[PDB]
Design an enzyme around this catalytic site. Structure first.
Site, PDB file in Angstrom:
ATOM      1  N   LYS A 122      -5.055   5.956  -0.291  1.00 10.57           N
ATOM      2  CA  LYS A 122      -3.734   5.876  -0.893  1.00 10.57           C
ATOM      3  C   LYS A 122      -3.290   4.440  -0.669  1.00 10.57           C
ATOM      4  O   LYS A 122      -3.188   3.976   0.471  1.00 10.57           O
ATOM      5  CB  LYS A 122      -2.736   6.831  -0.242  1.00 10.57           C
ATOM      6  CG  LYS A 122      -1.318   6.678  -0.810  1.00 10.57           C
ATOM      7  CD  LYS A 122      -1.270   7.043  -2.299  1.00 10.57           C
ATOM      8  CE  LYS A 122       0.019   6.588  -2.975  1.00 10.57           C
ATOM      9  NZ  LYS A 122      -0.174   5.339  -3.762  1.00 10.57           N
ATOM     10  N   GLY A 126      -0.649   0.963  -1.496  1.00  8.31           N
ATOM     11  CA  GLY A 126       0.772   0.696  -1.439  1.00  8.31           C
ATOM     12  C   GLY A 126       0.996  -0.794  -1.549  1.00  8.31           C
ATOM     13  O   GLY A 126       0.111  -1.585  -1.225  1.00  8.31           O
ATOM     14  N   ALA A 127       2.170  -1.177  -2.034  1.00  7.54           N
ATOM     15  CA  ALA A 127       2.529  -2.576  -2.159  1.00  7.54           C
ATOM     16  C   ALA A 127       4.042  -2.641  -2.059  1.00  7.54           C
ATOM     17  O   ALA A 127       4.729  -1.657  -2.302  1.00  7.54           O
ATOM     18  CB  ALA A 127       2.049  -3.138  -3.476  1.00  7.54           C
ATOM     19  N   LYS A 130       3.338   8.310   0.717  1.00  9.50           N
ATOM     20  CA  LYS A 130       3.112   9.424  -0.202  1.00  9.50           C
ATOM     21  C   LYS A 130       2.010  10.374   0.280  1.00  9.50           C
ATOM     22  O   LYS A 130       2.075  11.586   0.041  1.00  9.50           O
ATOM     23  CB  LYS A 130       2.794   8.884  -1.608  1.00  9.50           C
ATOM     24  CG  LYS A 130       4.011   8.250  -2.272  1.00  9.50           C
ATOM     25  CD  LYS A 130       3.692   7.539  -3.576  1.00  9.50           C
ATOM     26  CE  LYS A 130       4.977   7.012  -4.179  1.00  9.50           C
ATOM     27  NZ  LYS A 130       4.797   5.708  -4.831  1.00  9.50           N
ATOM     28  N   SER A 175       0.602   7.099  -7.806  1.00  5.77           N
ATOM     29  CA  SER A 175       1.683   6.480  -7.059  1.00  5.77           C
ATOM     30  C   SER A 175       2.991   6.685  -7.800  1.00  5.77           C
ATOM     31  O   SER A 175       3.866   5.829  -7.787  1.00  5.77           O
ATOM     32  CB  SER A 175       1.419   4.986  -6.872  1.00  5.77           C
ATOM     33  OG  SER A 175       1.792   4.588  -5.567  1.00  5.77           O
ATOM     34  N   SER A 177       3.975   2.668  -0.539  1.00  3.96           N
ATOM     35  CA  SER A 177       3.428   3.914  -1.089  1.00  3.96           C
ATOM     36  C   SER A 177       2.518   4.745  -0.218  1.00  3.96           C
ATOM     37  O   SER A 177       2.266   5.903  -0.534  1.00  3.96           O
ATOM     38  CB  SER A 177       2.689   3.658  -2.393  1.00  3.96           C
ATOM     39  OG  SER A 177       3.630   3.374  -3.383  1.00  3.96           O
TER      40      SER A 177
END
Lengths: 255, 256
Positions: free
Chosen positions: B202, B204-205, B43, B98, B40
């Site tokens: 920001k 993310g995974a 983004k 997200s 993510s």
């Protein structure tokens, strides 16, 4: 150890900090070790002057006397009769390392104390200006007066020339002067590939101090900020420009 | 740093770290050039390219999509299928929640992955390799570069958009504002920063226990610190732990 090898070959201490602004890749070597900054402080001085003066303010004529002249005044001693505009003094200071030009400009911004306050303002907590030229050359090993580090000098030069510390038009004036420097052909300019543009300010002093700070522009890419500092162990030691040229070659390679 | 190596051992994960104090040019690095799936975090870079192509007014442009356009995670877009959403709304959803559909819609607006990559290459990013839409970008296997980047490249690309002259001040504060108000990173970098410190991030995974967080941090007194903390494990179905990123952040701070 390429840098260590050069230290042995030239019997000098090296201070290096290079940052590729396009990739944030750095090249460092004794980046936080203090060295007397010598004439390199002239570049940061003009940076602060541009901060406080409008472009029209630079057309203001500054008058001085023979009594104002110090040790090295290639341009200023030739106009003592007519005075010089601040724009002309900035030119003399940066491109010819004129000492009186630096002194007159330093007075315009409030002296060493004000220069220091302004640098602290932009994030430079290291550079320590305390004196006028040529007294700033009176630095001994162990003291911090009139010294800085490769990281600090490179970062402050970047602040004024590439960042938002100055508006576009003023950054361009600073960069134009430095690009037209007349004293650094044998230093960083001698260690970069043909086609690379360089804007630099050289320096030299006691203890075989030999410095050069610059913004380098590859033909293709983002600028590289580079500070190459050096000193020797004897007060009367002589320096060799080749050390700077060679150190620069290693930096470019590493980058 | 041995402190980073110990965290890697304790959490059975790999860390990719790059921190830069823009005020001093001091850095904290650990496997800064090792590739990780960006998940993510992309983004934030996508919105940056968007703001780069559209005017603040263009952001008001309404975008119409259907249930066909909805993917695997659409907290916001799922509530406006019939109404539609403006680019500004989509950017907000993508950055703060997200939202996957929002990301895809924005990606299409800027030309797709190829265009995103091209623009990133234009700003100096030669490593970030976007190839797919959400959620396919999560299909990454060790050894492949598709939809991966490094802590150094992600941090540098974020800095270019948020702190440098890649975007006019006006658009830069739009990006920073959304990220400052992110709702998904309280237990990551935000949890490893001292009180009084402002964070724009920001998260993310992804697969292989990938857990990332890229951010711009503002200490009380001082210039911003750009930080990218990436992590992954060796098992495809490996579970991640947010504590690893919070702990890694604490080390970065002490170091700085």
């Amino acid at each position: 150890d390429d840098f260590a090898k050069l230290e042995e070959q030239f019997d000098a201490k090296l201070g290096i900090f290079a940052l590729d602004t396009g990739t944030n890749r750095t090249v460092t070597y004794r980046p936080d070790e203090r060295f007397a900054f010598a004439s390199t402080i002239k570049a940061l001085t003009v940076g602060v002057l541009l901060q406080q003066k409008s472009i029209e303010d630079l057309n203001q004529r500054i008058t001085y006397t023979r009594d104002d002249l110090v040790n090295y005044n290639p341009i200023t001693e030739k106009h003592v009769d007519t005075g010089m505009t601040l724009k002309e003094l900035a030119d003399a200071s940066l491109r010819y390392s004129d000492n009186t030009a630096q002194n007159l400009i330093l007075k315009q911004i409030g002296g060493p104390e004000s220069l220091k306050k302004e640098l602290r303002k932009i994030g430079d907590e290291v550079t320590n200006p305390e004196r006028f030229e040529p007294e700033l050359n009176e630095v001994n090993p162990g003291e911090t007066q009139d010294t800085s580090t490769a990281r600090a000098l490179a970062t402050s030069l970047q602040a004024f020339a590439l960042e938002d510390k100055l508006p576009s038009e003023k950054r361009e004036l600073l960069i134009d002067w430095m690009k037209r420097n007349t004293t650094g052909d044998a230093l960083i300019r001698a260690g970069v590939p043909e086609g690379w543009e360089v804007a630099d300010k050289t320096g030299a002093g006691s203890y075989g101090t030999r410095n050069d700070i610059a913004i380098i522009w590859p033909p293709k890419g983002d600028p590289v900020v580079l500070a190459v500092l050096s000193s020797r162990d004897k007060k009367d030691a002589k320096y060799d420009d080749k050390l700077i040229a060679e150190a620069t070659k290693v930096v470019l390679k590493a980058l």
